[model samples]
Target: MTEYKLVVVGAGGVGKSALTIQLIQNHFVDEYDPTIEDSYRKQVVIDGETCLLDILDTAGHEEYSAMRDQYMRTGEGFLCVFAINNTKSFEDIHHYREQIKRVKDSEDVPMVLVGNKCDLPSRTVDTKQAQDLARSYGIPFIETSAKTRQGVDDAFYTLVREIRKHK
Candidate 1:
């Protein structure tokens, strides 16, 4: 009836369907949100580890909800995702960190930092800075293209980084 629940979160326009559905359904969607409740659960074999997987998609999340505290307690992990940009998107991850940690009441709560969503022709998050930044917290950093299915699985598994415990 219960297993690990993951919350998909972060800032500056999330690639929800593009990201979540891509992994869950194994198909790429190029547009708006699906499963509009932004939640999906299923029995999955992650890292040869079998369990009923549960996830909450922010699905635009109306952008930084204070009400998120309710679900944070329900989750075992947070996918701290952000799109590439000059700055702002990447800047918001730490907020997601504190909020989730505060709710979970631990500084070492499980989470993953994803630098994703590059569907357009260009515009970027500067891979140089992102990878180096990840070194600071020692969090697993991932880059993805939901449309291309690149880094998507590893990004999700790395939460489990497929289940290694750096925590």
Candidate 2:
């Protein structure tokens, strides 16, 4: 069986784990707290395709330079998630990209910038700006809602498809 390992990254509290839970467990997580300092992993089998996503949900305001260091080394592909309503989260997408690039030692790694929390349109940031940034870095991107499962599968599948091209 073919397997693809993915990394879900972003600033803290951007719904990385929520999206991961929805994908892996077929359920959404509501009111989560990243109180513990650690990384979580889950595997999902979708339509005969298995994705082993190693999610590194980092601290938002608090910096985890060490966690970033490790994910950078082992991550295959990255889902750069950010809260559409939070400018800080959205702005930190670049930081996540740099971290991924540095640890992997490759600029060619497949990535998708995910603007999470699209279910709340009233709280949305500039989607076009996010897309433009993704384009600038040659990263595919989408606005998603784990609550509604909107564009959730597509976000992961698209990155897997891209990874397939290299292998």
Candidate 3:
């Protein structure tokens, strides 16, 4: 029963739509409407383990933090996403991480720190910067680009594996 309930969390304009769509509904692009909470379910094989992924591509904005607690409570894994060109969103991972930990009541939650927009060569937030933060949190870090579908599968698939390994 490899059914994974995953969530994608990050600020607006950070490519959450593209990342998720690439995985769930490829040929990724945008159409942001936080009003209707969008969740996608797909069956796929990762690392030779077949599983179903039900991903909650959540709404951002701090006003919705209250709503997040609900999903965080139920989600088994998360993709804490941010833009590589923007450091503000990079730092934005703190709230998503902290709130999920609080809601799940475990610091050992399965999460992948995703840096999107890697297709752009000039990345303001260095890869090591993201990796060091991951190291501190003891989670995996991956750079991605939804525009190109680069690492899109890797990010979510890795979380699938992360869930497999998480206690």
Candidate 4:
């Protein structure tokens, strides 16, 4: 079986852990606690191919910036996440993307721009803004709600597909 390393990243409380847990375990995590760093492994069949996904759920705090660069260096692909309810979270995606390119030493690294927490009643980031950024960078864009399990698999599978395609 093929193996891939995927790192989930975004601002604090933007549901990076929720999305990772939802995809790996098919359960929603209700509480929010700042993560230091965590890893998860799961075997999945995507597009008729079996693969092991090594998922790194990364801390979103600025204090972990150095660790994030190290994680970015190891990942084959990335899920650059943000919350629809938090505009600042969305804005931080650019910084994360640039850092990934710097660490990976490539501008064409496979990545997906994720807008999470669609279950929230109030949204601060507009869909078009996120999509425009994704379009400008030539990457895929998805909105996910871990609470509702909407687009959770799509986000994972899309990145996995991108990883495979690139490899």
**Ten residues in sequence with the least summed lDDT for candidate 2:** 35-44
Best by TM-score: 4
> Each candidate: what lDDT?
0.71, 0.77, 0.85, 0.91
Q: What tens digits encode model 2's per-residue C-alpha lDDT throughout 1-167?
A: 56666777777788887887787788988987673334556666756777665555445555656755764566667789899988888888888788778888888988988999988866757988988999999888888999999988889888777777767
Ranking by TM-score: 4, 3, 2, 1
Candidate 1 regions exceeding 4 Å error are: 34-37, 59-66, 161-167
Query: Taking the tens digit of each residue's C-alpha lDDT, what string does model 3 give over 56-147?
Result: 87776656556668766889998999999988999999988988899899888999999999988778999999999999998899989988
lDDT value for model 2 = 0.77
| Candidate 4 per-residue lDDT over residues 1-167, each given as its tens digit | 89999999888999999998998888988987789889999998999999999999988886646766777799999999999999999889988998889999998898999999998989988899999999999999999999999999899899999997887
Residue pairs in collision within model 2:
none
Candidate 1's TM-score reads 0.83
Clashes of each: 4, 0, 0, 0
- Better-scoring candidate (lDDT), 1 or 2: 2
Candidate 4: misplaced stretches above 4 Å?
64-66
Off by over 4 Å in 2: 35-64
